[PDB]
Design a protein around this nucleic acid. Structure first.
Lengths: 352, 199, 138, 109, 190
RNA sequence: GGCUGGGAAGGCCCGGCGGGGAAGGUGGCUCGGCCGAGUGUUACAGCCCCCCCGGCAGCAGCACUCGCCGAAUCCCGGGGC
RNA sequence: CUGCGGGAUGAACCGAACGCCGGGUUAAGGCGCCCGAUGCCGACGCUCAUCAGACCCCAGAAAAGGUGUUGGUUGAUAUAGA
RNA sequence: CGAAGCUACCAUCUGUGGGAUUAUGACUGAACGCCUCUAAGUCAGAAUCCCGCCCAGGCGGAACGAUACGGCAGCGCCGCGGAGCCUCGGUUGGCCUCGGAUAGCCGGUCCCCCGCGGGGUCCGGUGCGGAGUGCCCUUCGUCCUGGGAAACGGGGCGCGGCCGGAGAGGCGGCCGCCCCCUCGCCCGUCACGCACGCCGUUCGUGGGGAACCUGGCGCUAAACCAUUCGUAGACGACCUGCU
């Protein structure tokens, strides 16, 4: 027979490969569509979640009951040290897809970036990019590099920049830097390639990529929770206490005539550690890191024009389970996916 | 030793039956420009048929269900597989022999391609009837790379136009040379045309 | 844009059928896809024939639509259709195809040798013309 | 110095819908596609040539790895230039859609 | 059954010049040029008479539905000739009861803004097809004039700006508001 | 070999008879260079078609393969398994 | 109590009944591919379906309608002008 | 009372855009000298369908880095050689316009426009396609000399430069210098185990894979386990540190 009292299903059918993410760093599944009229600019950045705190501000939405009134918002701090550009890569559109055409790495590569290419750093001899750097110190190598750049300029449609985070400037234990391809959106392919080549072996701060009062997207892996039952994974109704063979379980799985279990049935399995892309996160404040002229300048982090104090975003005793934030940071409205110390990908909005 | 066919202007099943029969006999067949294939009947009817094919799906686990390929080349491959006994080793070998490409790749862009008059639209279909392009059907059913294929095909058309101009100039030069040199090869063209040549 | 019309008195070549490869003049139209036809000078008897098997040429002799097998012959002889057909390029290439079909082995060998020599001479002349044109362009 | 035989494709055995007779093979001879041009190939010898691991004998030469199965063309098969062939040993069905040589020296010219 | 032959003739004026690239008819004259690809119709288009006097449309061995196309081709050719010689002018008068419909042409004729339709705050912005020019006519309070060479384009633009002003969830028999086409004539009568 | 002792046709035609399509003619009109082409009206035959009077070998199921039944009114040769 | 060829599938349907084989020819059925054969320069017409149609048993449709289209029957009026 | 960690619309943050169209409303327009959303053709059109955002990522691809200096070693590119096991398909190639079918192919373009080339007008040749896949290209015996027509062509995986080609490029073109050869087409002139009629002959092949004998130019490992860490975890697996 039919279901007596209709009720919406539990969970989302569009989000249920419920497996631990193969990747740990958030992947940009779709970059913003590049308009060949705006100047060249990087469309993404890589930060690390530090913690959350309060923010107090006056809102300016006319007609609301809370207009011109003090409100408090939860804000998440993402420490975002400037990233070092170490390579560029071209992509050519093909009827089968978007095939990578040519990848060109820089001459000098930091040990933080070199650590990623080795599973074991202590055991290895650190021989990565040993003969490749010879191309930048020979006439034949320089000619080959020029020919590769010319080929990328002629043929490639999409150009991305390989940039790696600076793990030295972070309180995190690990030293293996995270590399990432960031698609460059801007003018013509030639100008874009020239800008990318100029930015080689250079630092990129967060002010270049993002600005204040901007809506962005945060991509990251959910804080894992291990094996979980259906009552926690899909938030199904709990069976009554009188049940014999358990109560935190799905009671009826499926009907008789289809002699198979449907993929839409809520089953017990992995919960957490899922790749997610939250959208419409507002940048409340891009705060400058610690800088020294004569002494330490920590006021720029948390001091405002109405507070005019000497406080930094670091609370008393530092952030819990993360460390102390000394570099440039971005403060986002609301919460973001992932636990502490977790690497997050900040992407420009894909919508008008 | 390998057949090269231009999918443009050919009817879907009419060409698929011939290709399957040829590939059963060990003949290697390559079909290009599968977006140029056109199916009889109105476009709305063909789209509704393909939407019904999409609706055919495994209820309990669609991952095991029918694989509805959206690319025109894969659609033609699947319609040939439907005429081939793919369950058997001979059918699998025929499928391996068959090759299908979206547009026309550089491996075959510089090769002359045959045309089957037994499957052509102008030959098998009345001019008063309607037909639907496989490229249009694929694009409206889920294909992604219509515009890229179109741009690459336009570039190839320009290059082939240049090549044809060069070849036509070469043929004109050959005609001029033959006209200028026929006096000393009169005894050869004469014996050529006595047996039914150059006439 | 049509240049050939099915008119009374037009000659047509029989592509296939019993009287294949013969000229025959249309006397009267019988139906939508059938015409009365007569071949007095081409050894074809007065008979019905479909339009599919006959391809109409560009010769139109004038005689009444129901001529009694004699006035059509007289018009054919007066116009001398056979000689003009032989002079036309259509019959010339038909005869060339027939000769190629009837070619024997010794004839094939002689044709191969002649083609070899003629092609070599033509290729040499074409190469000289190409280099002369390149020099002129330079 | 060149090819002295015609190319044929082993289309399959003489069969119905649900029964096959392995003693009569079907040959598709290249160049003939009607039951009028197949009169020349009636009675012609045919050979299936295949190479194997172990060396075998070879007339007029050193032992080779190549072996053949001989047969004779009996009659045509259904208006499309297909012909029927009978071999001394039935074809192994591995040669389905494979090349065989129709010799030219049961000559009747 | 199959009719052996159907033919029609259109005697074009001496002012215009027409040409046919196989099956595409191009007509040129004082106002401008109009092209129409008459393929997919399977007819014979001949241009006869010295000085290009008449255009003949032939259909051989066509059914009833095929014979119906000869006169539609002739009508299309006549409409093109009329557009090239005189042009097409559609006058549509605004009809309203209480709220006065405000029509403002914005760029040249392309953008038409309709405001205060049934008191709605939403402004109806309508695009006009290329070549068609929209204007507010004189000697009439609320009247719009659309001028063009292509009758199809002019009438399609008129239909668009008429269907834009549609009354929703009301009795249309009572709320007789909107802009409706009133007269369909030529720019110059001669 | 038989037929309607085959039907029409092919060639020379001769002395007549009536009817019809609508033609080296006439003719309203249209299109090009007196001529050519397309339409219409009475309509003899100098384009022809049909019927009635009357006769020549040229026939013959005819390789001008236009449409049958066939075999003591029937025999020969050749190819393939 | 019955195998065999065809009806995709199959009690009773069509053909046809059984020793082991080689060659030839059929019945019922078919000849785009699966799958042997129309790979005929097959003949004449009908049909557009945004629910087309596709072969005894048999696996599917009714009454009522349609200027969609193709034929037939009957009845008036039209150069005294429909 | 309560740190950390888990957790509650019991606290907090976020939840998107296009394409084709259904019903429908229309434009031009005959059938049916009038009229008609329909017969050809065209417009608007939505919780619809598809795609985009998002999750996983194919007995599917991508370019890039290092590629075992050892105390015995093992490899990568080049060239020309010898046997030595397995697996086989085969039996000259075509190196290319777009395109329409009630239409097309080729020149010159006196003429004009545009970047040697392209477009338009006019003219001239074919169109059951001879600038035909019913097609074209190469010959499939060798060597001696001794004449004629034709004739500076080719080769030595000939050595060095200049390019075209990115769709899944994987091939070709254009120039310099050394040596050698007289090859295509017709005629004499002989000789090639002439193996005495008997079948898998003849080639793409120096085919593809595995194990061994010649040299020149270059190489120096990374992965896993063990240990440790918690952003992870039933066990595996995963994020990390360690002259």
């Amino acid at each position: 027979s039919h279901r007596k009292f209709s009720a919406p299903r539990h969970g989302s059918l569009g989000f249920l490969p419920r497996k631990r993410s193969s990747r740990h760093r958030g992947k940009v599944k779709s970059f913003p569509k590049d308009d060949p009229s705006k100047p060249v600019h990087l469309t993404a950045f890589l930060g690390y979640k530090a913690g959350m705190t309060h923010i107090v501000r006056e809102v300016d939405r006319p007609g609301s009951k809370v207009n011109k009134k003090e409100v408090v918002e939860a804000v998440t701090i993402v420490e975002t040290p400037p990233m070092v550009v170490v390579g560029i890569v071209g992509y050519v559109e093909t009827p089968r897809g978007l095939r990578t055409f040519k990848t060109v790495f820089a001459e000098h590569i930091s040990d933080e970036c070199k650590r990623r290419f080795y599973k074991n750093w202590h055991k290895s001899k650190k021989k990565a990019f040993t003969k490749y750097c010879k191309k930048w110190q020979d006439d034949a190598g320089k000619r080959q590099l020029d020919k590769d750049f010319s080929s990328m300029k002629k043929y490639c449609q999409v150009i991305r920049v390989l940039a790696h985070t600076q793990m030295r400037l972070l309180p995190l234990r690990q030293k293996k830097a995270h590399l990432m391809e960031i698609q460059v959106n801007g003018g013509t392919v030639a100008e874009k390639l020239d800008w990318a080549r100029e930015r080689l072996e250079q630092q990129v701060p967060v002010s270049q990529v993002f600005g204040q009062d901007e809506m962005i997207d945060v991509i990251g892996v959910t804080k894992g929770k291990g094996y979980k039952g259906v009552t926690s994974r899909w938030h199904t109704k709990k069976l009554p206490r009188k049940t014999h063979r358990g109560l935190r379980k799905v009671a009826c799985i499926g009907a008789w005539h289809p002699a198979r279990v449907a993929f839409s049935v809520a089953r017990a399995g992995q919960k957490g550690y899922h790749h997610r892309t939250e959208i419409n996160k507002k940048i409340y404040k891009i705060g400058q890191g610690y800088l020294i002229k004569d002494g330490k300048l920590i006021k720029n982090n948390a001091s405002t024009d109405y507070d005019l104090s000497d406080k930094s975003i670091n609370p008393l005793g530092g952030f819990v389970h993360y460390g102390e934030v000394t570099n440039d940071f971005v403060m986002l409205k609301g919460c973001v996916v992932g636990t502490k110390k977790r690497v997050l990908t900040l992407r420009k909005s894909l919508l008008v | 030793q390998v057949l090269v066919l231009d999918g443009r202007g050919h009817l879907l099943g009419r060409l698929a039956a011939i290709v399957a029969k040829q590939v059963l006999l060990g003949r290697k067949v390559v079909v290009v420009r599968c977006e140029g294939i056109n199916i009889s009947g109105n476009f709305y009817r063909n789209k509704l048929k393909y939407l019904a094919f999409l609706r055919k799906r495994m209820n309990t686990n669609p991952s095991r269900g029918p694989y509805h390929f959206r690319a025109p080349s894969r659609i033609f491959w699947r319609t040939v597989r439907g005429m081939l006994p793919h369950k058997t080793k001979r059918g699998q070998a025929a499928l391996d022999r068959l090759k299908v490409f979206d547009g026309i790749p550089p491996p075959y862009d510089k090769k002359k391609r045959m045309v089957v008059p037994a499957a052509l639209k102008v030959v098998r279909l009345k001019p008063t009837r309607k037909f639907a392009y496989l490229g249009r059907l694929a694009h409206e059913v889920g294909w992604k790379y219509q515009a890229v294929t179109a741009t690459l095909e336009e570039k190839r058309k320009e290059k082939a136009k240049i090549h044809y101009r060069k070849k036509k100039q070469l043929m004109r030069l050959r005609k001029q040379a033959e006209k200028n040199v026929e006096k000393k090869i009169d005894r050869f063209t004469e014996v050529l045309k006595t047996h039914g040549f150059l006439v | 844009v049509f240049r050939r019309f099915v008119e009374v008195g037009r000659v047509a070549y029989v592509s296939f059928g019993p009287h294949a490869g013969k000229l025959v003049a249309i006397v009267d139209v019988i139906d939508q896809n059938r015409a009365l036809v007569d071949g007095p000078c081409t050894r074809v008897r007065r008979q019905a024939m479909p339009f599919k098997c006959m391809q109409l040429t560009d010769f139109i002799l004038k005689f009444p639509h129901s001529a009694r097998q004699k006035y059509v012959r007289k018009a054919w002889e007066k116009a001398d259709i056979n000689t003009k057909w032989a002079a036309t390029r259509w019959a010339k290439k038909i005869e060339a195809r027939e000769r190629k079909a009837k070619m024997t082995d010794f004839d094939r060998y002689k044709v191969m040798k002649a083609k070899k020599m003629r092609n070599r001479i033509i290729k040499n002349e074409v190469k000289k013309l190409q280099r002369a044109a390149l020099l002129k362009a330079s | 110095s060149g090819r002295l035989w015609c190319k044929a494709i082993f289309a399959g055995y003489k069969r119905g819908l649900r029964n096959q007779r392995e003693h009569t093979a079907l040959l598709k001879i290249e160049g003939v596609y009607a039951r009028d041009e197949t009169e020349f190939y009636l009675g012609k010898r045919c050979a299936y040539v295949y190479k194997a691991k172990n060396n075998t004998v070879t007339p007029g030469g050193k032992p080779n790895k190549t072996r053949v199965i001989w047969g004779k063309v009996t009659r045509a098969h259904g208006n499309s230039g297909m012909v029927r062939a009978k071999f001394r040993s039935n074809l192994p069905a591995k040669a389905i859609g494979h090349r065989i040589r129709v010799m030219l020296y049961p000559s009747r010219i | 059954m199959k009719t052996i032959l159907s033919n029609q003739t259109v005697d074009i004026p001496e002012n215009v010049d027409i040409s046919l690239k196989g099956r595409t008819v191009i007509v040129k004259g004082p106002r401008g040029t109009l092209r129409r690809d008459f393929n997919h119709i399977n007819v014979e288009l001949s241009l006869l008479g010295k000085k290009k006097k008449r255009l003949r449309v032939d259909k051989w061995w066509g059914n009833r539905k095929e014979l119906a196309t000869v006169r539609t081709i002739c009508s299309h050719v006549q409409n093109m000739i009329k557009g090239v010689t005189l042009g097409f002018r559609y006058k549509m008068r605004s009809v309203y009861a209480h709220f006065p419909i405000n029509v403002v042409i914005q760029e040249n004729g392309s953008l038409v803004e309709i405001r205060n339709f049934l008191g709605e705050k939403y402004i109806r912005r309508v695009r006009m097809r290329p070549g068609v020019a929209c204007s507010v006519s004189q000697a009439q309070k609320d009247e719009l004039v659309l001028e063009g060479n292509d009758i199809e384009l002019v009438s399609n633009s008129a239909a668009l700006i008429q269907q834009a002003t549609t009354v929703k969830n009301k009795d249309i028999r009572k709320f007789l508001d909107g802009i409706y086409v009133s007269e369909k004539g030529t720019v110059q009568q001669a």
